[PDB]
């Protein structure tokens, strides 16, 4: 869409309805008459557009008002409330922009932000720009966290986030206009390639390719139908996984292929037995005939002249013999029917197998693709919920960040107090404040203490999950938080980066599949990406394979990599790689995994629980209920945008708004 309604869309909002968050800051309006709502909605929408049309410069309340007309620029308290709301929640002036009103000189409130992931950084900038005192503590010697970009000479390749998943309604859209990201479109085309054990590695032809895919999607829908219509969600007090459900469906497809054949051969027999009965009648009649003809013969035989009874005989037997030849003729008629009604059925057999061995192998590649998307064994995903964020998909083609995704967190880091090599060990929050105890990663006895009004925790769910803890909460987080932590899934996926001196693959093709020999290893090196300027080929390790490949050496890994590739492009077109990398995200102690997924027994609602701030008990008993002190952002905290950079970015903004309302107060709400 476009106009002012394009704006609402590109900011993930309904252009003609007020959202729940808006209703909260503007109950006066939304509970009031329809006319004002549209004024509101228009003001909101116009400001969005204004910001969007130019996100390299701060958009001020004055600058806004200046560009409105009557009846809209009439009421100016409104225009001020709206502008303020938008600014506070990072819908306008987020990211990297030129300030017009350089920073108010002494600052209010003090916030420690654990981790300089994108979520962290996005929050920090907001807060700082809101005039707060912000410090980020980062364990690693760089920012960006799970945005990790491999550099060396001219090779550039992400071992972390790698794709912008469509600009349509994506905050990263804005960022890319504020930052030299080199966005290249990815072409959809993806040839799969069964290697055939040691035999001849060969493409899958456009015929199978399409019917196996088509079958896969047919099978997914089945599980969805099985879930939502039949309520097949608990099996033995265990929740049902996507993996299980896919199995149960596949079985019922096999079962039916058989129920088909059974009734088809049961039809062949019930017909083939009408025949067995007929032939009987017919053999018995050819007896009766044979012998009547004898009788008539013998009566004929009696040479004339004849008395009348002896003449009657000849005539009589003659009639009778003709009668029986009528019959045996209706019956060779009837036999004629069946005899071909049999050559009918016997030429139209129903389907032989549900899926061939070669079929089910391609089907597995599709399954791997899903396991990649969710960084996990389909046996771990929620049947009902695994795909709960689907409505919030962006539009437009996916893109790669050609100059390396790290370019984003780096740019965001500019101007911030980031303490690298500092590993948070303990978080202490109380009615009067917070201290964070961190050590220096290089000499882990050198200790630091940080005092603050509030803590924003952007620790990975993998981290929050460590047993035994790597970060201690004083006091312990409540059951409700720590159970969300247990329930949620934190999966894993890895990357092998291959650097050569020459393109030896099809330059115009961005992605191509490898279809191996077993279900058990469908994840292993199943997909290759050709994205970069230099000659780099990048290969996924997903599913059950991901975890296992982590205890295998780079050489061995690059081994199977070169194998597969020689297999496809010819033994001598595939040179030794000049440079290689292999990510190990589960092993990496500052991540302990790759991104979250809705585990079986969890739901998208656990994501809400995750983002719920923590409020300490009172110091002196009987003292008034305190302020909240411990806040959370991060990919594992945004239900509508899980597992992604833009999701993380968003959660950052979310908390920076919520923290500012709490500690700087909410001007705009009256």
């Amino acid at each position: 869409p476009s106009g002012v309604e394009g704006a609402a869309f590109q900011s993930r909002l309904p252009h003609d309805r007020m959202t729940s968050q808006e209703a909260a800051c503007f109950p006066d309006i939304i509970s009031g008459p329809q006319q004002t709502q549209k004024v509101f909605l228009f003001i909101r929408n116009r400001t969005l557009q204004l910001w969007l049309d130019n996100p390299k410069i701060q958009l001020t309340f004055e600058a806004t008002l200046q560009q409105l007309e009557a009846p809209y620029n009439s009421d100016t308290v409104l225009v001020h409330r709206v502008h303020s709301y938008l600014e506070r929640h990072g819908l306008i002036n987020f990211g990297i922009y030129k300030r017009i009103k350089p920073l108010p000189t002494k600052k209010t409130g003090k916030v420690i932000i654990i981790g300089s992931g994108v979520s962290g950084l996005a929050a920090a900038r907001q807060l700082q720009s809101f005039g707060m005192d912000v410090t980020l503590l980062e364990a690693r010697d760089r920012v960006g966290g799970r945005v990790a970009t491999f550099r060396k000479g001219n090779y550039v390749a992400d071992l972390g986030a790698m794709v912008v998943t469509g600009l349509g309604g994506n905050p990263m859209a804005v960022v890319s206009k504020q930052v030299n990201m080199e966005l290249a479109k990815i072409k959809q085309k993806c040839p799969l390639y069964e290697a055939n054990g040691q035999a001849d590695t060969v493409k899958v032809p456009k015929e199978k390719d399409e019917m196996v895919e088509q079958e896969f999607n047919r099978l997914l829908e089945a599980t969805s139908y099985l879930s939502h219509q039949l309520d097949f969600n608990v099996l033995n007090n265990k929740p049902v996984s996507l993996g299980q459900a896919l199995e149960v469906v596949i079985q019922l497809q096999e079962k039916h292929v058989k129920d088909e054949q059974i009734e088809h051969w049961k039809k062949i027999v019930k017909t083939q037995e009408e025949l067995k009965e007929l032939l009987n009648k017919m053999v018995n009649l050819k007896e009766k005939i044979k012998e009547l003809h004898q009788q008539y013969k013998e009566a004929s035989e009696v040479k004339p002249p004849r008395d009348i009874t002896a003449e009657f005989l000849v005539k009589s037997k003659h009639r009778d013999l003709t009668a029986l030849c009528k019959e045996y003729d209706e019956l060779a008629e009837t036999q004629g029917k069946l005899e071909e009604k049999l050559q009918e059925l016997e030429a139209n057999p129903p389907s032989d197998v549900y899926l061939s061995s070669r079929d089910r192998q391609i089907l597995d590649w599709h399954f791997a693709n899903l396991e990649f998307a969710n960084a996990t064994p389909l046996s771990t995903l929620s049947l009902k919920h695994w795909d709960q964020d689907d409505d919030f998909e962006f539009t437009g083609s996916h893109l790669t960040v050609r100059n390396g995704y790290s370019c984003v967190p780096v740019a965001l880091a500019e101007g911030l107090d980031i303490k690298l090599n500092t590993a948070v060990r303990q978080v202490r929050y109380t009615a009067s404040g917070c201290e964070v105890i961190a050590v220096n990663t290089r000499s882990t006895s050198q200790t630091f203490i940080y005092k603050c009004d509030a803590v924003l925790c952007t620790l990975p769910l993998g981290v929050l999950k460590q047993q035994p803890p790597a970060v201690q909460f004083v006091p312990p987080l409540p059951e409700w938080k720590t159970s969300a932590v247990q329930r949620m899934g934190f999966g894993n996926l890895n990357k092998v980066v291959l650097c050569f001196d020459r393109v030896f693959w099809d330059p115009s093709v961005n992605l191509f599949g490898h279809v191996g020999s077993t279900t058990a290893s469908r994840g292993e090196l199943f997909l290759f990406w050709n994205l970069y300027k230099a000659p780099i080929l990048l290969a996924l390790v997903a599913g059950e394979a991901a975890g296992i490949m982590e205890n295998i050496s780079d050489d061995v890994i690059v081994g199977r990599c070169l194998a597969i590739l020689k297999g496809i492009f010819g033994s001598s077109a595939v040179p030794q790689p000049k440079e290689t990398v292999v990510s190990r995200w589960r092993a990496d102690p500052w991540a302990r995994g790759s991104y979250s997924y809705v585990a079986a027994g969890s739901s998208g609602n656990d994501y809400d629980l995750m983002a719920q701030p923590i409020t300490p008990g009172p110091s002196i008993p009987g003292a008034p209920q305190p302020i909240p002190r411990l806040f959370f952002a991060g990919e594992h905290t945004i239900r509508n945008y899980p597992a992604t950079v833009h999701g993380a970015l968003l959660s950052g903004l979310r908390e920076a708004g919520r923290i500012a309302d709490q500690f700087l107060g909410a001007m705009y709400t009256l």
Partner: peptide
């Protein structure tokens, strides 16, 4: 999640 998919997006059980 499904939203992660670039290659051969799955389709089945999505609500267009």
């Amino acid at each position: 999640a499904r939203t992660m998919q670039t290659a051969r997006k799955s389709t089945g059980g999505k609500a267009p």
